[PDB]
From a paper:
Recently, a newly identified type I-F variant, known as the Cas8-HNH system, was discovered to lack the Cas3 helicase-nuclease gene in its CRISPR loci. Instead, an HNH nuclease domain is naturally fused with one of the Cascade backbone components, Cas8, generating double-strand breaks in target DNA molecules. The RNP complex displays an overall G-shaped architecture, comprising single copies of Cas5, Cas6, and Cas8-HNH subunits, six copies of Cas7 molecules, and a crRNA molecule. To elucidate the molecular mechanisms of target DNA cleavage by the type I-F Cas8-HNH system, we reconstituted the Cascade complex and obtained multiple cryo-EM structures representing the target-free, partial R-loop, full R-loop and ssDNA-bound states.
Author numbering:
A (entry chain H): 1 to 82, 95 to 255
B (entry chain A): 11 to 233, 235 to 333
C (entry chain G): 1 to 95, 102 to 341
D (entry chain B): 10 to 330
The structure:
């Protein structure tokens, strides 16, 4: 049960779903950690037996599909359907840091991740290219990027009546704060409603929950867990956090 | 025995095409020169040129308004456009991202395995990379040129360059050994014998000094009312969707071909966007062919199988009506 | 005003009192048809068979963390139809008037008492309208797997339309919330029965992109790109076996690097790495089996001046001659 | 096989695709050995209110003259001749229908193009287009004063005999000169499909004088005030819009109803509209939006003047149902 950190450097996602209802741009972090559970699901489909517990996101470069107008407000661009439902897309040169624990962490499982990730998509976006997949030992072994930490303390200690009002007040104080999508809150009790993806899984209608996150520099960040995301499932409150 | 189609069946794309990135080079020195090609802006004036009744024409002829129109053009010094795009292909048996009934999944696995030992996705691969060979991924950029050279690289091996202005767009050729070897590569990586194949294609087109390069127009859905092109990383490029639709025009089996004699891109009801009437309305479609393959086990003519396993390579939401 | 709006709602050849007489009949004819919801699944995909939706007023209001529809502004409820023919109640909700029916005000009671009386059970009707209940998940609602413990649980995401209306209004009031990207991607033929998307077809949501110096410009793309000398070494008479034996062709060797090196400086962080496989393959170009004695490699286009670690870029210089050209590239580019 | 209506998507592409017209400055005695860059300069103008006004606020107009930063161009106190370089690519008319919904109209238009191809194979129109090349109307207001205007027309590394542009009048078209006819024959061939493309590079030398003023193509300013003459800049140098150059090389319509009375060619447009003259010259009848419905939907033989028009707007494009 050795624990190791695997860095996927310069992953170029093209046309990831930037639209997340009230949030357009940074995709839902549930996409970026369901990439980890898909990359573990297909690895335990093979004989690798890796259980990924946390994933840290470093957003190195970004581009939103659309054009800047005269005023400054963007206009998003979408594919032409074969009635256009609300949708928008983003390209992300971002690097993953995977906390991996299991039988053993070695360079051969980096080659296995190298083989496996080239059939995967992150947030519905294809992978053009990758720089390197390397096991890191310290914060120094991480290139210059900007991690996405969950600054929930800024949203909690914010002046307002409702928490939206608090978020509007929070984005009007610090500028590096970005409102990000984290998890899904239950809207109904679980059960076998008809018309599912896979009939055997229990199914629950949900609603996306949202929070406020911040960008922390590479050699300014303290610790590695402080930038690692994890899945937590309270009863009716599925969500990914930083603890 | 099955009774219907599933409720959440969704294949994914088996021929993922990355976004093209346009560059401007000179033919004599094209293996080194690679200057960025940017999206410049110009001011056009509205011509007001639609049909309108002959009484009111003095109103909308004498009040024009300027519209800022993004236009892409080459430099005076450089005379070739360099379209660089990528391709990632995955096997179709694994492209079934979502499925509901396991009996259906076993049936479609068995039918794909039945085609896989019959032809083994060769003719599909010939046509898909033949569209690379004709360079239809230069939609209106190829209506006049001299030597449109397509150079295709697999892994680290650069396959021989192909002069696209010797292959007709309406006649698919199956004799070329480069096309045969590359189609065997895409066929074996489409079968499941391989699990991934990257294909990087660089195309050089001699449109001439200072002439116009046409990139993909961004859907503004906003008002402006101006031609706005796609600026990828500050440079021109095609919307990858267009690239996949260009490589996808392989259907020469649509009903009533002897009369029309032109290949159309594969969709469900055979709806190409040049001809308004759907070419494949009923008793030749996707939905009434898997019903006529899986729901009622019966062998189909091999052209039908080529079509339906072409759109199965496309991906989309093949499902029930609910 | 309000009675004038009710009279202007139905303007036929029939009299205005008969117009009120039939409009109030439609008012107590369409509340049973239309339903009330906070989330409509047709907002994700218009072609969603059946009215799939949920009410989130039941969940309490918390100030502990995060953001949900219950934990938000959430002032106007969202009236939802199925067919447009059996639907016109939004004239008495918007004509706000929804606040007037929400705040137990009796001036709307006076207006409806002037109209055809019957205000109180109409108030009951738009406050006991059948609350939208989810009973089916269709391929067009976004169904996502998510783990609980070690087993995945199917989560069908019903989009929050009420939150969408709340943010659009508050962001306009915010004026400068920084995150203000407008989605103008919906047309007038919205068969989604929600009132709030009919009020705003173009929602105003947050722009949540990384801080605005990580956006890839043309320069960033050029930085990643590397340059290669045009010199065709495979012939280049004076260079035999791959080695710059002749010193006459030397000045071209500095000039090609200086031409593709001038104003091409690139900090080490963005420079190509000196992989050993490139000099290994350049040794396998013609025999050798190691780097030959007294000859050693040189990127014709200086690495610092945007060079690649490719096969078609590198060369073998003599040691004294390498000293000459490295003094040249030290002086010319001012390292 | 009867034709009922016109297609929902009926879009032709440009069969006469012009580049931008890049400006340079040179001396005329050494034009072939000179090519200095022409740059857009910046000047302050003061608002001289010359619009109409009642005698109410003219004192307020003279009281506060707001200056405007206008971009204008003067060559140099040394150069003497404009050098326009611009390229044109003529493509076959048949391989330019960008969309046609119905296929019956498509084969009707292909049969109709071939009918014209048999009788006068795009030679009249080509001669007129190259006659529009010859008289040098590329210079819209730059032509107004000169002593020698010389246009050289290179076809695929073959420098043709140079043209005198002031000897050829703006109001009459010449069918006699050998160079104009053989260049028009190459363009007639390119229109056919007998040749799939032709790149034509035209260089115009106009000797307006020393340190005189050029007149580049204006550009629309930003909507948030800043009203001023913002000229076009192509590659750090002045340039004209391909729309101006095509409208210059599209003034081939002399077959308009009110000709014997106006006797001046207008530019080819869908209802015969000249923006500087007014009163649309080809309204109702003699309008493609009725003539090609009289030519394709119905099936009579139009006279060759209306046949000259109805397939001369087909190099331009832009229709619908």
């Amino acid at each position: 049960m050795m624990k190791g950190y695997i860095l996927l450097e310069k992953v170029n996602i093209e046309n990831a779903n930037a639209f997340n209802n009230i949030i357009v741009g940074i995709p839902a972090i549930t996409s970026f950690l369901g990439f980890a559970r898909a990359l573990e699901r297909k690895l335990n489909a093979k004989e690798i037996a890796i259980r990924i517990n946390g994933v840290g996101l470093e957003f190195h470069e970004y581009e939103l599909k659309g054009y800047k107008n005269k005023r400054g407000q963007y206009v998003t661009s979408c594919p032409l359907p074969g009635h256009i439902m609300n949708q928008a897309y983003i390209d992300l040169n971002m690097s993953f840091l995977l906390e991996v624990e299991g039988p053993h962490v070695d360079m051969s499982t980096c080659k296995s991740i190298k083989s496996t990730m080239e059939t995967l998509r992150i947030a519905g976006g294809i992978i053009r290219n990758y720089k390197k997949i390397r096991l890191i030992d310290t914060l120094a072994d991480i290139p210059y990027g900007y991690f996405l930490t969950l600054r929930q303390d800024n949203l909690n200690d914010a002046a307002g009546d409702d928490m939206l009002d608090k978020m509007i007040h929070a984005l009007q104080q610090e500028d590096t704060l970005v409102p990000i999508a984290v998890g899904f809150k239950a809207l109904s009790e679980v059960g076998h409603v008809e018309g599912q993806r896979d009939p055997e899984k229990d199914h629950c209608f949900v609603e996306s929950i949202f929070s406020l996150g911040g960008f922390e520099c590479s050699k300014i960040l303290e610790d590695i867990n402080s930038c690692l995301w994890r899945y937590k499932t309270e009863e009716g409150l599925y969500l990914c956090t930083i603890i | 025995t099955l009774k219907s189609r599933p409720e959440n069946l969704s294949f994914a794309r088996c021929l993922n095409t990355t976004e093209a990135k346009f560059w401007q080079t000179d033919f004599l020195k094209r293996h080194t020169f690679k200057l960025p090609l940017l999206i410049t802006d110009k001011a056009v004036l509205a011509s007001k040129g639609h049909e309108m009744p002959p009484d009111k024409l003095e109103k909308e002829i004498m009040d024009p308004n300027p519209q800022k129109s993004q236009s892409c053009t080459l430099s005076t010094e450089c005379d070739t456009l360099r379209i660089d795009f990528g391709i990632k292909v995955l096997p179709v048996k694994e492209s079934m991202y979502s499925c509901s009934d396991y009996n259906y999944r076993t049936a479609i696995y068995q039918k794909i395995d039945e085609y896989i030992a019959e032809d083994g996705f060769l003719t599909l691969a010939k046509r898909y990379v033949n569209n690379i060979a004709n360079a239809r991924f230069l939609w209106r950029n190829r209506k006049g040129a001299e030597i449109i050279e397509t150079i295709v690289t697999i892994e680290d091996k650069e396959y021989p360059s192909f002069n696209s202005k010797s292959f007709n767009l309406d006649t698919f050729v199956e004799d070329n050994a480069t096309i045969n070897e590359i189609a065997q590569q895409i066929a074996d990586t489409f079968a499941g014998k391989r699990e991934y194949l990257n294909i990087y294609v660089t195309c050089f087109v001699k449109i001439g000094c200072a002439m116009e390069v046409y990139p993909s127009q961004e859907m503004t859905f906003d008002d402006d009312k101006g031609k706005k092109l796609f600026k990828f990383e500050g440079s021109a490029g095609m919307h990858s969707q267009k690239i996949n639709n260009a490589l996808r025009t392989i259907d020469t089996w649509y009903p009533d071909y002897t009369t029309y004699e032109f290949p159309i891109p594969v969709e469900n009801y055979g709806a190409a966007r040049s001809i308004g009437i759907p070419f494949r309305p009923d008793t030749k479609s996707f939905y009434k062919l898997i019903d006529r393959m899986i729901l009622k086990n019966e062998d189909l003519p091999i052209e039908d199988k080529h079509y339906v396993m072409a759109i199965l390579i496309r991906g989309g939401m093949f499902s029930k009506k609910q | 005003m309000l009675r004038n709006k009710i009279l202007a709602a139905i303007s036929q050849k029939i009299p205005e009192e008969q117009k009120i007489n039939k409009y109030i009949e439609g008012l107590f004819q369409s509340i049973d048809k239309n339903h009330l919801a906070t989330h409509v699944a047709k907002f994700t995909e218009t072609n969603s068979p059946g009215n799939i939706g949920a009410y989130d007023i039941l969940s309490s209001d918390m100030n502990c963390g995060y953001l949900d529809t219950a934990n938000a502004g959430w002032k106007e409820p969202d009236i939802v139809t199925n067919d447009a023919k059996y639907k016109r109640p939004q004239g008495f909700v918007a004509m706000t008037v929804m606040e007037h029916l929400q705040e137990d005000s009796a001036e709307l009671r006076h207006e409806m008492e002037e109209l055809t009386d019957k205000y109180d059970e109409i108030r009951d009707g738009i406050l006991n309208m059948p609350s939208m209940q989810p009973y089916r998940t269709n391929q067009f609602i976004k169904q996502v797997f998510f783990p609980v413990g070690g087993s995945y649980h199917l989560l069908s995401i019903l989009p929050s339309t009420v939150l969408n209306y709340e943010v659009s209004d508050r962001l306009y009031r915010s004026k400068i919330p920084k995150i203000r990207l407008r989605l103008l991607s919906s047309n007038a033929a919205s068969t989604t029965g929600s009132r709030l998307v009919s009020k705003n077809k173009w929602p105003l949501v947050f722009q949540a992109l990384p801080p605005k110096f990580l956006e890839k410009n043309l320069a960033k793309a050029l930085d990643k790109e590397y340059l290669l000398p045009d010199i065709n070494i495979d012939e280049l008479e004076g260079v035999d076996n791959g080695c710059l034996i002749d010193e006459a062709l030397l000045p071209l060797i500095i000039d090609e690097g200086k031409r593709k090196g001038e104003g091409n400086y690139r900090p080490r962080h963005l420079r190509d790495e000196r992989k050993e496989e490139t000099v290994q393959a350049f040794l396998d170009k013609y025999g050798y089996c190691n780097i030959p004695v007294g000859y050693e490699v040189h990127h014709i286009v200086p690495l610092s001046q945007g060079g690649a670690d490719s096969i078609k870029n590198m060369i073998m210089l003599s040691i004294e001659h390498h000293e000459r050209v490295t003094e040249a590239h030290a002086s010319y580019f001012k390292w």
